[PDB]
Amino acid sequence: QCQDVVQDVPNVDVQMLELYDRMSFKDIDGGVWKQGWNIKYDPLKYNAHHKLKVFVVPHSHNDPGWIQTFEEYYQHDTKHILSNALRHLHDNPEMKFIWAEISYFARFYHDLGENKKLQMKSIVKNGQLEFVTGGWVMPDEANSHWRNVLLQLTEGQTWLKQFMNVTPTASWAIAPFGHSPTMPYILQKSGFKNMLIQRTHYSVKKELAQQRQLEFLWRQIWDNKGDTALFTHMMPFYSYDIPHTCGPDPKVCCQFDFKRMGSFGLSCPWKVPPRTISDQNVAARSDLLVDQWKKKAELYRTNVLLIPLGDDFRFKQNTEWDVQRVNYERLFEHINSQAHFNVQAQFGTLQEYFDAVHQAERAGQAEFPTLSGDFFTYADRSDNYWSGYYTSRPYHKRMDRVLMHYVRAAEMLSAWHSWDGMARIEERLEQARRELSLFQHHDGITGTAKTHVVVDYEQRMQEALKACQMVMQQSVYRLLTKPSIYSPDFSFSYFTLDDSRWPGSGVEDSRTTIILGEDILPSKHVVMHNTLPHWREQLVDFYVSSPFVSVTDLANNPVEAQVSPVWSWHHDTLTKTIHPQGSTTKYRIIFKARVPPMGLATYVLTISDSKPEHTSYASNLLLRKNPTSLPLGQYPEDVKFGDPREISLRVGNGPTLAFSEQGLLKSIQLTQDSPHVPVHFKFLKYGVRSHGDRSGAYLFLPNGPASPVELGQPVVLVTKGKLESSVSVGLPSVVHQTIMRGGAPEIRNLVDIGSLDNTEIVMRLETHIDSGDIFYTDLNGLQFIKRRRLDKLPLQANYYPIPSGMFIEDANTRLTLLTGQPLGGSSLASGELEIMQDRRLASDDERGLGQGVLDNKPVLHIYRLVLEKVNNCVRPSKLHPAGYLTSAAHKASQSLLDPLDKFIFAENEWIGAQGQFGGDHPSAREDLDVSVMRRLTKSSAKTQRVGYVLHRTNLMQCGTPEEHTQKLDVCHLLPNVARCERTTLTFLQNLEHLDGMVAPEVCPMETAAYVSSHSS
């Protein structure tokens, strides 16, 4: 019986939106705890019968790229940290250490000799070395898509299970810049029992600490019953470094970072150095330290205290291991033997801490509050809100989403078969998963790494895209060739991928033209793949070398097509205008492909000597003063010219869109009769402050509200076709395109911020929707959370991640903007939405990156814009912290994130070609997705296993009967099923053996994983 995620407002002790509405956020000087208060404790709280149990947990934060690349850090730091951890833990049985980043650990362990592997396995098995989280990385939580958070978690944990025989159940996330409830969502469905977070707004830490609500059961915002809850520990202070982890006074705690005495090149900024512990000072030093611990303990409810002991790339040299270990051992020996402290302190691991906390809870010592909400937008001090990284390096943010889809499609397409090892399918998929997983790091997708590190991530992702293409095209060839003809060369490219939106028109000329001609090749097969588990139609386009091309399906049924020119925009450095040029030798052909669920469909493009019966030609109108001619080769319609003017377009029976004379949307009319609803796109710019703190890769510190971009008299290109029309305009730094295909328009911005230093370009929508101070943004592509604009916070605090969409609404009307890339955005006034396109910042923002953001490159951002009437929708009540998409907005998001894949057959003739794959696949209800399909076994396994992650979203009920679909049972998608299990989302633990080998569908907002096993 599925929980209702709409109509029941959960009762939680802390609801972060409500807390935000009540909190004052005053930034007062709290004393040595600058953002807190002077903590007081009663010395008599702890006594012989009630001691404070202190776990000092050594750690080393290892960034998989940040100011050096992964490999540079591995060579210069991490391999030494791990080698010396292995030696020192081996030699010191009571010493402990936690490790989070499995990308580094796997890199290290595979290079170890067998003797050392065995030693390493032993210190893990005996609990000295403990993995925390066990993902490939410690991912960003703002920009990352939940699918990639799960991918990287699975990549690390699958490695750990295979090589270390452990599966962490405690998560450690000390570094991401703000925290998302998507993490406890995924972790709780992946076996976890506990998680730790750190980077939350200093005001939130103060507020929760005052109420001893820093440990809480974190449930999802829609979860009325609480089954999603995951115990969460929030660290209370400003950093995870040693000065901010022993207690509230960093001037004292820094004295207990024994790497800071000088020979290591480190010191304490509070000007009191550590001193080596001796018999003559250990009582005074213990008094100071235990006092810090007892103050920290006042912020929490049990008598078990967590004291992290670590910092970035710590525990590298042997002398550092010694200096920390020996000094802490001297303190523990003293403290634990002095009854008056009533403390027992020891090195521990994270799991040991949580185990002891829950023993205290079970003993009735504490009850923990429940919490829902998120922890964005983080500020670590004053007005320094970390909303810049929601946009920084947007090229790679978009690339993340492209690769996300490519990985899913490559894993799904190749899962249908078992492949010989010679095919290198598993090799290529592992590479692709690992490079995408690496980029989920909190300096990867966030855009907060040095320029050469961003290049390394991009190069890795490019190799991952090539790997996905290889696997996908080999799979299509196999799936659509008569078996007794199939004759693969696993190194050959049978197909090339054609992607219209990455890197994108104006970004890279990467797309192959299908070259047809009477004297070379009459026709070409193309194949579309649909990774979604429902039948799908989508227009697809290809470049062709003639306008006289017609399309057939493989029953030779004509398919209606539209040919349009190939337009490319040029920054004309002679005329100082931005204007489009059309090709005279290549053309776009567009047609509707209809593709089975999780399936493939083949079409044929054929040249003819003149206009074919079922192909139409778009008209083109270039609006500008001072036009010049625009020849288009054989294209049969001459370009028309006019002065700038307002224009209106309608494709099919879809909305009618009206545009200003600058080529920007001004209104949407949903139907013939209905009103022209004002919806106005505008581009604006934010600058940087000339006094005080400067924006950089992390921080957004605008110098006031944005100023409109001066547009001049831009050139507007209108293409009008039966299947697709568009309005494109060359604005300064953005070629802005509105594309209409009969439903909600697609927006594409080719953003080139050029050399505009200290500028952030924002795209705003202005409407007269009476949204007030409310808007909705998504978290990791998984859920939409209610936001409230707070004028008591500065502008940048009202920016939130827009990882896949945002909307505003009133009682009657909603405007949703779906994105194909994570970007930052807000609603800074009633009726507005805005989303940042790019930012170019000359200054460093003091968070360690040591550079601004001056490596911009053109990026094609894509969106869908859905205006809808919502007065008939069953929406959550006014107090509910969630919102939900409509069917149309969800499909529009899927059209961006998981479009059809397009394959062009590379050779002249495809012998044995088949017309379709997957026609018998069930077409599941529109809210269900097969987020992952992954064969889990190599071909030598007698029992093959295939893993599926199913995700059901929740779409609002708005009165559309919309029904009859088939049940999707993933366990029967492959034949000869012998067992069906429900598993954790990482596939690593079987949770239920399923009757009848039937994988039941999941409830709204739930995600489940199943593994089918097959005997043949």
Residue 294 CB, nearest approach to Zn ion (Å): 30
For Zn ion, the closer CB: 392 or 738: 392
For Zn ion, the closer CB: 64 or 580: 64
Phi, psi of 791 (to 5 degrees): -75, -10
At 91, list the tokens. 């030699």
Nearest one of 336, 366, 297 to 42, comparing CA atoms: 297
> Which is it for the CA torsion 157, 158, 162, 163, positive or negative?
negative
Taking contact as CB under 5 A, which single stretch among the options 6-14, 174-182, 207-215, 919-927 is the one that binds Zn ion? 174-182
Give the E-state strand segments of 876-942 in sequence order: 882-883, 901-905, 916-917, 928-935
For Zn ion, the closer CB: 223 or 443: 443
484 Cβ contact list (under 8 Å, min separation 6): none
**Calpha distance 1000→1012 (Å, rounded):** 12
Given a contact cutoff of 8 angstroms between Cβ atoms, the answer to whether 748 and 504 are in contact is yes
Nearest one of 725, 714, 654 to 868, comparing CA atoms: 654
Residue 531, SS3 per DSSP:
coil
Residue 100 CB, nearest approach to Zn ion (Å): 10
The one-letter amino acid at 383 = D
Residue 190 CB, nearest approach to Zn ion (Å): 22
Residue 457 CB, nearest approach to Zn ion (Å): 14
For Zn ion, the closer CB: 133 or 759: 133
Longest dimension (CA), the chain: 99
Residue 270 CB, nearest approach to Zn ion (Å): 23
For Zn ion, the closer CB: 199 or 952: 199
**Calpha distance 134→144 (Å, rounded):** 17
Residue 345 CB, nearest approach to Zn ion (Å): 27
For Zn ion, the closer CB: 454 or 623: 454
Nearest one of 64, 26, 66 to 698, comparing CA atoms: 66
C-alpha 165: how far from its chain's center? Answer: 28
Counting residues that bind Zn ion (by CB under 5 A) gives: 2
Residue 445 CB, nearest approach to Zn ion (Å): 13
Given a contact cutoff of 8 angstroms between Cβ atoms, the answer to whether 750 and 598 are in contact is no
Given a contact cutoff of 8 angstroms between Cβ atoms, the answer to whether 437 and 136 are in contact is yes
For Zn ion, the closer CB: 139 or 702: 139
Residue 446 CB, nearest approach to Zn ion (Å): 10
Residue 595 CB, nearest approach to Zn ion (Å): 41
Numbers of helices and strands, H then E, in the chain: 16, 51
**Calpha distance 822→861 (Å, rounded):** 10
**Calpha distance 478→824 (Å, rounded):** 42
Whose tokens are 């890339």? That residue is 821
Beta-carbon count within 10 A of 413 CB: 27
For Zn ion, the closer CB: 850 or 919: 850
Phi, psi of 710 (to 5 degrees): -70, 115
Residue 104 CB, nearest approach to Zn ion (Å): 12
The one-letter amino acid at 746 = E
Each residue 55-94 as x (binds Zn ion by CB under 5 A) or -, in order, gives: --------x-------------------------------
For every residue of 740-795, DSSP letters joined together read ESSSSPEEEEEE--TT-TTEEEEEEEEE----TTEEEEEETTTEEEEEE--TTS-G
For Zn ion, the closer CB: 63 or 868: 63
Residue 462 CB, nearest approach to Zn ion (Å): 24
Given a contact cutoff of 8 angstroms between Cβ atoms, the answer to whether 641 and 579 are in contact is no
Nearest one of 780, 830, 827 to 931, comparing CA atoms: 780
Residue 442 CB, nearest approach to Zn ion (Å): 6
Whose tokens are 């980043």? That residue is 101
What's 273's DSSP letter?
-
For Zn ion, the closer CB: 167 or 448: 448
Residue 238 CB, nearest approach to Zn ion (Å): 15
Residue 997, SS3 per DSSP:
helix
| Binding to Zn ion, residues 551-580 (CB under 5 A) | none
What's 690's DSSP letter?
S
Given a contact cutoff of 8 angstroms between Cβ atoms, the answer to whether 979 and 939 are in contact is no
**Calpha distance 28→23 (Å, rounded):** 13
Each residue 128-167 as x (binds Zn ion by CB under 5 A) or -, in order, gives: ----------------------------------------
Residue 96 CB, nearest approach to Zn ion (Å): 21
Residue 63 CB, nearest approach to Zn ion (Å): 4
Residue 62 CB, nearest approach to Zn ion (Å): 8
Beta-carbon count within 10 A of 137 CB: 32
For every residue of 872-883, DSSP letters joined together read TSB---TT-SEE
For Zn ion, the closer CB: 200 or 213: 200
Tell whether residue 380 is a contact of Zn ion (CB under 5 A). Answer: no
Each residue 175-204 as x (binds Zn ion by CB under 5 A) or -, in order, gives: x-----------------------------
Residue 167 CB, nearest approach to Zn ion (Å): 23
**Calpha distance 305→964 (Å, rounded):** 56
For Zn ion, the closer CB: 376 or 784: 376
| Binding to Zn ion, residues 761-780 (CB under 5 A) | none
**Calpha distance 990→267 (Å, rounded):** 50
Residue 157 CB, nearest approach to Zn ion (Å): 20
For every residue of 44-79, DSSP letters joined together read GGSBTTBPEEEEEEEEEE--SSSSS-HHHHIIIIIH
Given a contact cutoff of 8 angstroms between Cβ atoms, the answer to whether 362 and 413 are in contact is no
585 Cβ contact list (under 8 Å, min separation 6): 545, 633
Taking contact as CB under 5 A, which single stretch among the options 149-157, 173-181, 544-552, 948-956 is the one that binds Zn ion? 173-181
What b/e string do you get for 574-604 counting C-beta neighbours within 10 Å, with b at 16 or more?
eeebbbbebbeebbbbbbbbbbbbbbbbbbb
Whose tokens are 């569908």? That residue is 1001
- Contacting positions for Zn ion (CB under 5 A): 63, 175
